[PDB]
Amino acid sequence: PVQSSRTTFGVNPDRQANARPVYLAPAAPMENTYTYLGSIQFAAGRHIFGEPASNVLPPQNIVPGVPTKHGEYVTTNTGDRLMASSTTVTRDVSNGRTKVSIDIPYYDRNAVETLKASAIPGAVAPVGSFKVNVEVLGGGVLTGTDANAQFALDELLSNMLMDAARIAQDGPKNTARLVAASHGVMPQA
Amino acid sequence: GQLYMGQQGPVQSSRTTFGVNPDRQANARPVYLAPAAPMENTYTYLGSIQFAAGRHIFGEPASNVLPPQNIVPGVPTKHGEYVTTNTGDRLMASSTTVTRDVSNGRTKVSIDIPYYDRNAVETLKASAIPGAVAPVGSFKVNVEVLGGGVLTGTDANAQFALDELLSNMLMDAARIAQDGPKNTARLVAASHGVMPQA
Amino acid sequence: GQLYMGQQGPVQSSRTTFGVNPDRQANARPVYLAPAAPMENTYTYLGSIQFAAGRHIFGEPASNVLPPQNIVPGVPTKHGEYVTTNTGDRLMASSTTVTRDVSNGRTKVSIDIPYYDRNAVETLKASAIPGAVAPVGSFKVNVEVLGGGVLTGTDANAQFALDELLSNMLMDAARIAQDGPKNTARLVAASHGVMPQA
Amino acid sequence: PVQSSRTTFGVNPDRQANARPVYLAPAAPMENTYTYLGSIQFAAGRHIFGEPASNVLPPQNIVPGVPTKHGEYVTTNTGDRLMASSTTVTRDVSNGRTKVSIDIPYYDRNAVETLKASAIPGAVAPVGSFKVNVEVLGGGVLTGTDANAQFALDELLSNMLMDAARIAQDGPKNTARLVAASHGVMPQA
Numbered sequence: 001p002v003q004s005s006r007t008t009f010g011v012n013p014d015r016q017a018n019a020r021p022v023y024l025a026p027a028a029p030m031e032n033t034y035t036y037l038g039s040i041q042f043a044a045g046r047h048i049f050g051e052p053a054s055n056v057l058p059p060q061n062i063v064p065g066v067p068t069k070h071g072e073y074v075t076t077n078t079g080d081r082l083m084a085s086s087t088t089v090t091r092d093v094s095n096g097r098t099k100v101s102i103d104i105p106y107y108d109r110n111a112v113e114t115l116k117a118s119a120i121p122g123a124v125a126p127v128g129s130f131k132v133n134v135e136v137l138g139g140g141v142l143t144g145t146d147a148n149a150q151f152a153l154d155e156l157l158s159n160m161l162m163d164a165a166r167i168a169q170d171g172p173k174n175t176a177r178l179v180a181a182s183h184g185v186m187p188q189a
Numbered sequence: 190g191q192l193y194m195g196q197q198g199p200v201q202s203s204r205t206t207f208g209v210n211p212d213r214q215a216n217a218r219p220v221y222l223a224p225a226a227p228m229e230n231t232y233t234y235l236g237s238i239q240f241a242a243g244r245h246i247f248g249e250p251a252s253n254v255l256p257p258q259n260i261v262p263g264v265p266t267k268h269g270e271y272v273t274t275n276t277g278d279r280l281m282a283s284s285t286t287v288t289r290d291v292s293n294g295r296t297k298v299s300i301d302i303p304y305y306d307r308n309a310v311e312t313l314k315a316s317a318i319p320g321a322v323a324p325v326g327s328f329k330v331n332v333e334v335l336g337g338g339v340l341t342g343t344d345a346n347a348q349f350a351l352d353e354l355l356s357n358m359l360m361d362a363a364r365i366a367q368d369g370p371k372n373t374a375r376l377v378a379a380s381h382g383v384m385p386q387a
Numbered sequence: 388g389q390l391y392m393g394q395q396g397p398v399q400s401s402r403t404t405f406g407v408n409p410d411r412q413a414n415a416r417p418v419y420l421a422p423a424a425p426m427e428n429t430y431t432y433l434g435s436i437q438f439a440a441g442r443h444i445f446g447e448p449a450s451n452v453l454p455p456q457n458i459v460p461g462v463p464t465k466h467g468e469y470v471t472t473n474t475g476d477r478l479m480a481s482s483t484t485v486t487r488d489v490s491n492g493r494t495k496v497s498i499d500i501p502y503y504d505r506n507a508v509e510t511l512k513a514s515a516i517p518g519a520v521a522p523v524g525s526f527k528v529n530v531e532v533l534g535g536g537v538l539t540g541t542d543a544n545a546q547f548a549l550d551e552l553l554s555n556m557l558m559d560a561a562r563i564a565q566d567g568p569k570n571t572a573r574l575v576a577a578s579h580g581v582m583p584q585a
Numbered sequence: 586p587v588q589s590s591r592t593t594f595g596v597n598p599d600r601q602a603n604a605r606p607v608y609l610a611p612a613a614p615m616e617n618t619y620t621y622l623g624s625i626q627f628a629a630g631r632h633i634f635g636e637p638a639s640n641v642l643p644p645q646n647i648v649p650g651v652p653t654k655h656g657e658y659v660t661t662n663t664g665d666r667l668m669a670s671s672t673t674v675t676r677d678v679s680n681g682r683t684k685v686s687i688d689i690p691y692y693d694r695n696a697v698e699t700l701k702a703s704a705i706p707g708a709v710a711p712v713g714s715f716k717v718n719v720e721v722l723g724g725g726v727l728t729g730t731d732a733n734a735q736f737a738l739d740e741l742l743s744n745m746l747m748d749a750a751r752i753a754q755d756g757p758k759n760t761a762r763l764v765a766a767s768h769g770v771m772p773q774a
Contacts, residue, residue: 003588008281009320010309010591011479011521016378019466020457023369024382032364033357044350045343059384065463067381089365093382100366102358110342111209127211127340130355133333134362138377140326142244143482144308144472147374147455149243154376156242157330158367159230160300164332165363166230167287168298169356171221179336179351180214180343184222184269184291186262244472308472308480316477318517323591374459383462407696409712412765419756420769428744428751440741441734442727460771467769479593485752489769496753498745506729507595518594524725528742530749531718534764538712540695541630541765548629549764553715554754555618556687560719561750562617563674564685565743567608572732574739575723576601579652580609580678582644 014143018096020150021067028057028073028089030102042079046109050077050085057089069094081115082107083123096139105129136161212341216294218348219265226255226271226287228300240277246307248275248283255287267292279313280305283324294337303327334359410539414492416546417463424453424469424485426498438475444505446473446481453485465490477511478503481522492535501525532557599728603681605735606652613642613658613674615687627664631694635662635670642674654679666700667692668708681724690714721746 034055042049057073073089090101105126115122136157141150171177190202232253240247255271271287285302303324310322334355339348369375388400430451438445453469469485483500501522508520532553537546567573619640627634642658658674675686690711700707721742726735756762 003586006587006589007592008323008589009313009318009518009593010306010322010325011593012591013306013325014482015326016456016468017466018378019380019464019468020374020378021381021383021459021462021464022379023373023375023462024384025365025368026384028365029368030361030365032360033354036354036357040350040354044354045347046340047343047347047351062382062384064384064386067383067463069381071382071384091365091382093379096377096379098366098376098379100362102362102365104358108209108211108340114208124209127209128338130351130358131335132355132358132362133331133335134359134366135331135333136366136376137329137331138379141378142306142325143470143484144480145243145245145456146470147458149245150374150377150457151371152238152242153245153328154367154374155371156231156234156238157328157376159234160228160302160328160330161332161363161366162230163228164298164300164330165359167223167226167228167289167300168296168332168334169359170223170227173349173353175221176218176348177221177352178296178334178355179294179348180216180218180339181220181291181294181296181336182217183219183265183267184260184289185219185265186222186224186257186260186269188262189224308482312479312519315474316517316519318519323589372459373462374457378457385461406699407693407709407712409693414765415767416761416765417768417770418766419760419762420771421752421755422771422774424752425755426745426748426752428747429741432741432744436737436741440737441730443730443734443738455771458769458771460773463768463770465768467771487752487769489766492764492766494753494763494766496749498749498752500745504595504598504727511594516594520595521593523595523598523727524600526738526742526745527722528745528749529718529720529722530746530753531720532753532763533716533718534766536713537765538631538693541632545630545632546761546764547758548625549632549715550762551758552618552621552625552629553717553763555621556689556715556717557719557750557754558617559615560685560687560717561746563610563613563615563676563687564683564719564721564746565739566610566614569736569740571608572605572735572739573608574683574721574742575681575735576603576605576726577607577678577681577683577723578604579606579654580647580656580676581606581652582609582611582647582649582656584649 016141016143016145018139022093022098024062024068024071024091024093026064027059029055030057030089031055043109047106048079048109048112049104049106050079050082052077052087077105081112081123083125085126097135097137099133099135101131101133103129103131134161210341213338214341214343216337220291220296222260222269222289225257227253228255228287229253231302241307244307245304246277246310247302247304248277248280248285250275250285275303279310279321281321281323294335296334296336297331299329299331301327301329332359408539411536412539412541414535418489418494420458420467420487423455425451426453426485427451429500439505442505443502444475444508445500445502446475446478446483448473448483473501477508477519479519479521492533494532494534495529497527497529499525499527530557601726601728601730603724607678607683609647609653609656609676609678611649612644614640615642615674616640628694632691633664633694633697634689634691635664635667637662637672662690666697666708668710670711682720682722684718684720686716686718688714688716719746
């Protein structure tokens with residue numbers, strides 16, 4: 001049996017194992033989002049948000065010097081006639097894939113303001129949350145690559161991250177771009 | 190539950206669902222779809238390192254800004270792709286892709302760039318062989334915004350404020366993802382995380 | 388058991404576990420991790436034989452001393468790799484690797500060097516063909532130090548003495564491994580051992 | 586069906602069978618370790634070791650001229666208020682893989698010295714041992730390789746052995762490097 005093929009020069013590569021321990025931040029900064037929340041005075045629609053304790057979130061379950069494949073930073077949200085609720089930043093580092101997720105809760109502004117205006121002492125639990133996920137598939141580094149080269153790959157993935165976030169938020173602030181999304185339409189241009 | 194002192198007398202604390210409207214607004218909102226995808230940051234860095242880190246050799250793009258592949262103005266889609274074609278010396282040209290999926294309030298952008306075997310490419314150059322190399326693997330970065338389930342009284346104007354809130358969470362998330370000194374390992378070939386004592 | 392004469396009279400010998408403390412100290416001791424791996428002996432010999440023994444042709448290293456591949460200063464790991472890339476005339480460049488695993492008191496160092504088909508390489512040179520050859524196989528050498536289970540009263544200072552004791556056993560082991568005249572076969576393609584009568 | 590491939594020149598090699606009988610030492614020298622044991626006066630921590638009979642270990646189960654795939658050299662350890670105990674060097678030669686292992690026992694110095702100081706005539710059996718393994722994977726010699734070339738491969742593996750042992754013991758004697766190992770840390774440098 002004679003078979004046909006399409007050839008290029010080379011050999012299937014030798015991949016390096018994902019045995020490289022990585023740096024883990026001793027705290028998570030959330031300055032951008034919380035300054036914007038201060039901007040809108042923690043309210044939009046009938047979503048009302050809580051004021052954090054710190055713009056920088058301390059670690060909750062990360063002992064220093066202890067390898068952890070999953071870790072959480074958390075700070076508490078307080079507010080007038082709000083039940084204290086935690087905002088959470090989750091990092092999962094495993095098998096060459098690193099993933100960061102951010103979850104902030106929101107309350108029913110109608111309930112909160114009805115309580116405030118009526119001078120009722122009830123405290124409201126959160127009605128929902130908003131979440132943002134970010135993921136970096138950094139596995140499969142080739143065997144020849146040394147430590148210094150892997151540093152370069154680190155910064156390369158960093159810049160791809162920045163580009164992905166810009167492409168996600170890209171657009172005029174005049175038009176709808178993220179929430180309650182149904183479908184995308186390219187402008188007539 | 191617990192007991193406290195109200196002006197009627199000692200009174201039992203109570204937790205009720207009375208007066209909380211959790212109704213949600215349907216994800217029926219058309220969103221802006223960019224006419225091209227700017228990858229300026231990654232490609233300026235790739236020019237910085239001369240498109241080579243260790244054994245990973247990268248292709249030179251057609252453009253720093255990627256044109257649409259299956260998106261047409263005025264046609265609504267839930268999936269859109271931008272693409273250019275990387276080229277290089279003794280490298281078979283290979284596409285780099287940026288995918289955007291917008292469904293049910295969930296927006297997701299993924300970036301996939303290929304690379305090639307520098308050991309093979311420099312073998313080709315050094316011993317003056319006439320062949321070329323095909324891509325050997327890729328790197329991928331995903332970003333996801335779960336913006337579903339806005340409340341019913343969310344004003345049309347306030348949805349823009351929510352838009353900007355989510356985009357700022359995006360920026361914070363990428364910063365937390367790449368945060369750390371460049372003296373130490375932080376992203377690729379990751380096994381686990383180790384935060385330093387001091 | 389057996390009977391002997393004690394000053395009380397004939398007395399039975401006895402074997403007891405009384406007064407023996409076998410408690411062990413946990414393997415919780417950080418160890419030094421070299422910032423590079425020196426392969427000087429093997430590569431000076433490879434220069435001696437001109438990187439060729441029979442049909443096995445070897446690559447020329449980048450350095451006699453190998454840099455770390457996934458080790459970063461100040462980050463603790465239980466697995467560390469050093470690597471360089473062998474190159475050669477009409478040879479596709481191929482990595483040589485030195486792996487160190489440190490777990491639960493057991494330290495293990497392994498060395499893997501590839502080789503190529505000299506019949507193919509000299510066919511390429513002789514008939515003026517333009518291609519190159521990929522590695523055909525490898526040789527591997529493993530070394531293992533089982534240093535777990537130190538006793539409880541082992542002083543912090545005395546653990547260094549134990550360190551040096553184990554390293555001297557290492558040297559003796561390699562000498563016993565390669566011991567023998569170079570007139571006669573002793574390592575590769577080994578089937579069995581035959582010690583000479585005289 | 587058209588399939589793609591990555592080509593280099595050559596043919597999958599013809600390997601030679603592992604039918605090459607090898608030299609077997611008529612005794613095992615342990616001079617390095619036993620001179621060091623004399624240095625520390627056979628004691629460290631509460632490990633106490635025995636004095637050997639010979640620095641060079643005779644064979645126990647190796648008849649000369651008899652092919653053996655497994656053999657042992659052994660010498661007896663004696664000491665004051667110590668039960669005689671054997672230190673063992675084991676060689677396994679099979680299927681192109683040769684492996685040498687060294688096992689030396691140690692006793693409870695607290696028990697031994699309590700007996701000595703109290704002038705008690707008890708003899709102590711070993712509480713544990715330390716072991717070092719060394720292994721050479723020499724199979725797969727290519728068919729073209731002749732006897733003289735195989736000599737060269739012998740010495741090549743010898744030098745890789747030496748390098749592996751140096752890389753294993755490498756480091757300052759100021760810092761911890763082998764026993765009770767938990768994890769490795771590269772110095773700030």
